């Protein structure tokens, strides 16, 4: 999935916010890896994507 930088911290166990609560939620006992990187050069447009 694609999210905002201020929402990257929400892809973690126990977090709250519009993404953690309504789009994608991890279990409290989640085991695994959360990998994130900047995609501004690929997803952004001057008109807005």
């Amino acid at each position: 999935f694609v999210i905002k930088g201020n929402e990257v911290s929400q892809i973690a166990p126990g977090q709250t916010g519009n993404i953690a609560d309504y789009n994608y939620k991890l279990p409290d006992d989640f085991t695994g890896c959360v990998i994130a990187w900047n995609s501004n050069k690929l997803d952004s447009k001057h008109s807005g994507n």
Binding site: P13, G14, Q15, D28
Partner: protein, 49 residues
């Protein structure tokens, strides 16, 4: 009848068991390093992890 200390051997047993139970209950109000002694305050103030 006259000597109030005559039965101390039994009164000490009663008092020691009463003190042990009162101490055990009083320990429930301690924090042991936690922010609060009440589980509901911890659950409502902090996120799961």
């Amino acid at each position: 009848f006259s000597t109030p200390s005559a039965l101390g051997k039994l009164q000490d047993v009663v008092n020691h068991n009463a003190q042990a139970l009162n101490t055990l209950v009083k320990q429930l109000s301690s924090k042991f390093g936690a922010i609060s002694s009440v589980l509901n305050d911890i659950l409502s103030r902090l996120d799961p992890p």
